[PDB]
Design a protein around this ligand. Structure first.
Ligand SMILES: [Zn+2]
Length: 7
């Protein structure tokens, strides 16, 4: 699956 990390 697609992953996004918004630190
Ligand atoms: Zn994946």
């Amino acid at each position: 699956g697609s992953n996004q990390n918004n630190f």
